[PDB]
Specification:
Helix content of chain C: 55-70%
Number of strands of chain C: 0
Order of helices and strands of chain D: EEEEEHEEHEHHHH
Largest sheet of chain D: 2 strands, parallel
Helix content of chain D: 25-40%
Strand content of chain C: under 5%
Oligomer: part of a larger assembly
Number of strands of chain D: 8
Radius of gyration of chain C: 21 Å
Bound molecules: iron/sulfur cluster
Structural class of chain C: mainly alpha
Distance between the termini of chain C: 50 Å
Largest interface: A-F, 54 and 69 residues
Order of helices and strands of chain C: HHHHHH
Structural class of chain D: alpha/beta
Chain lengths: ~100, ~180, ~160, ~200, ~100, ~325
Amino acid sequence: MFSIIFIALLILLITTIVMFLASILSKKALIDREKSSPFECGFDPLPFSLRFFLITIIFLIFDVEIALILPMIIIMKYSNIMIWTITSIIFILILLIGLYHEWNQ
Amino acid sequence: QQTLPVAEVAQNLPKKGYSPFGTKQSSVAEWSLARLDDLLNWGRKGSIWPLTFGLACCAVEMMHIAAPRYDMDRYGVVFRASPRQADVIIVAGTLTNKMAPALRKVYDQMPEPRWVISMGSCANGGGYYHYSYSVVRGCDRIIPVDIYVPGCPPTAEALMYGVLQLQKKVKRMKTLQMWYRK
Amino acid sequence: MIQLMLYSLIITTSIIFLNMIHPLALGLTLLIQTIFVCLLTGLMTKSFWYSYILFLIFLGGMLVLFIYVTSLASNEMFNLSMKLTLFSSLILIFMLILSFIMDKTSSSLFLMNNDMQSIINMNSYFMENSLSLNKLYNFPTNFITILLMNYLLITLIVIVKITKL
Amino acid sequence: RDAFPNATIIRPADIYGSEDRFLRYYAHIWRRQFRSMPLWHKGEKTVKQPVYVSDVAQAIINAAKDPDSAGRIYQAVGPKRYQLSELVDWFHRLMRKDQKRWGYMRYDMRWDPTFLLKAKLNSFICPGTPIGGLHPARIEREAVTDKVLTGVPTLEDLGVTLTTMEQQVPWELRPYRAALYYDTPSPPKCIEARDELRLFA
Amino acid sequence: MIMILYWSLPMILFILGLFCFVSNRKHLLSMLLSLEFIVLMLFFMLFIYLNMLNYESYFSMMFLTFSVCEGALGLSILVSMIRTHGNDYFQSFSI
Amino acid sequence: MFYMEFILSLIGSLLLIICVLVSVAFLTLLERKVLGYIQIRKGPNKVGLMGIPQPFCDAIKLFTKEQTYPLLSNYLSYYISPIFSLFLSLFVWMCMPFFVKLYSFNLGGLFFLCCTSLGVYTVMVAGWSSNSNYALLGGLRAVAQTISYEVSLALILLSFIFLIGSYNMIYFFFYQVYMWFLIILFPMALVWVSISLAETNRTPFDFAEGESELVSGFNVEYSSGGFALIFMAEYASILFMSMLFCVIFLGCDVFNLLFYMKLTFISFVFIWVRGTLPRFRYDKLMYLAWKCFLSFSLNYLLFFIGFKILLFSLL
Ligand code: SF4
């Protein structure tokens, strides 16, 4: 993992050096009032959305749920088979029943 | 004009070469800046990205250089919708009085170097609505124009001839030599 | 040594987290703190499973809600100060040279890694991330993870009711 | 004037506007030093009378059209005198730098050799124009106060109405404003003749 | 001693995050972000505890599930005042 | 600990980064060329010889143009998105299955899910700091589709990990010594193509970063080097998805030249679906990511739970 830190810091250093040299190599012109303006098509110029927030919340709940589906590949050769099967079938079946119930309602 | 050279005369003429400056520079620093400017102009003329600015009928011919017969993509030319990512704006259509601040703002948000192609008689000189109450008399009063393509709907060979003339202008750009002489 | 570097980075990001006030900037400080916390909890452990779990759950899974809410909360940009950057760099170089002049054997953690264990340890040779995750899927502790999945579904039911949709 | 005898000499004091070397030079990051602007004698000693670029362009045209301006020196200065400290504080009030979380501080330039070392290194390493115009000639120009000469004509003799500073400058410094921290500006005080004589005593 | 050299830093940063949680110079979003900062420090200290034991590190995703549900609960409490208190309630320095 | 391991790991990682970047440039050339041949028209030509240095013409132009900003006062947050985007696109390649050892990633799928979970973060800072309503809309739409198929991608790769029995990417090689996984996982092949064109913004999932409904989603204010780094990061994501399709479904075959021929073929397939399909909608893409692909993921995960239990009794 210590080599991963060194190579990630080297990628970050190389990208910042490339962008700094690109900013030096960029052609410096006179800065303007209208050039700095945010682009709206043509003529010059959002509230909170709850639907996207519950999309993020559904993503979070399913992400923490996936983080419990993640370990059981390793445990299948090192656990009780009946307990592992009962928990896996119950886990994915309650997930499917909840998904279908939230679809129907 | 000049008479184009007869082949008896032109066989005695040497080859022009790629560089408009020539390789006969005196100083080694001047020669190095000349070749760096040649490489920079080759990179700039090797890919100009025009902006999707189609105001009126001329733009129906503008898509006809996108079309498979003429094929602008093998000239470095590919359309970009955002004005930041684009090099060129092709004024292809009729600039009106309500269209003037939109065109000026879109041109001002474009980053420099900025070459402008006026496509069609409404773009340069006003054209067929030159005496109208709500048509700007050419776009040269608002946006500074480098290439002016003449035809009312320019054929697409003539628009691409304007594109090649813009590429010859970009190849003739002198920046580092001017910096050495500034 | 690199554990002390992560100590210094967490101290520096925590004091700049205390200093700043812009909400997306605190969100950025949290997302760059979570990486160092993940690595530093990876230094004590046998294998990097729980650092990955904390990574997907906290940073990529949960804090994107915080980044979205703090992005739509603040209209303005960051006011970057070179004074705070210089102070953070000065305390960072001071704490790295303090870790240079300090014995790293006494400052290392007593928690055993996978290679810090005994060679005659039978359980370490079997399978990476096997015996630690075993009690999740065995009797009688499987009822907790069944209750956890039910808890996450019930959490979603709570969240739909309280936001009123 | 030795070569061309009938040559009109307009003498601008310091010209402000958009894309200038005055407001952009006092608006740049490279001019400041850790959110604090160094000024010579804290900006209190020097009194400057800046002029707009449209006013001096109208003065150039009014000298070109009217042929009584042959060989006459025209002092191109603004309507009112201001000292540099009040000008810089008014500029930072316009850019919303007056908030307490920004940490605006005005201090003496002669105590800070690091700023002059930075200006010399900026004049060294830049191949083209230096960034922000922080050459030492601009430093000595901001050190020199604007002195008008009596008996020598001013642009009001050329028939141009000089634009006041408070009308034009907030429009120039409107895009230069900082982002507001998550936690109208006052106009600056002009310096009269007797107050300038008291300050220079 | 053992407390001074080992696990002293999560205590200090936990008290710093607690003081950022309750200071009157901050706002509600800063309270929630400092709350997840002390969640991260709690994970750090809990993992230092759980790694004295060999194979009980599986509890780390239980506390993670509960505290992440707490964080989503706090965000959904805080954004439920958008349609009632307006969009300016995030800058409130007092409750 | 032996220092030539560190030296050769550093040399191999830097050589991988350099070859990935030049392959990104030639992938932009390949996409502009054969994407033209999707229609009747020709690809790039007339620059250099037969259009080969056209991406270098792009690189000289994009590194010279004026670095414009969405606002004039404070724009350091505008810089940090292409840096982290190219950093993640060059950092995700460290979990490639190398048979000669470069990094012993025993958990490579989790590393891939981590870098994909930062993809939402770099596109969110891309959207917000560009100060435009089009930029915020494109950033929110890209974050929406990428977290919508993040859960689906995690479940699909989680179903694939049940086949090899571990999280080690090189274990895809030993279970493909007799046949490829394209035979056994062909609906998973179509679903994985729909996944890999969703995390990386391509034409079938292009409501995030299209030129029709928005002018550009989050590259609208990015130009003159930042757009170059973003473009290189996105094409490196395309190259990574082509490699990851070629490891899981097609046999890993890391040494053989046929593996890299198949990687170029899956890049050709990515440009082939670039020219064919239209673009989905927001409502239909929420229908696709959370109902159809999620139901298929959980169902066929149940199928491999039953199959891995059935083979465990027989073996
Ligand atoms: S110049 Fe002619 S073809 Fe073009 S917009 Fe005008 S009328 Fe139409």
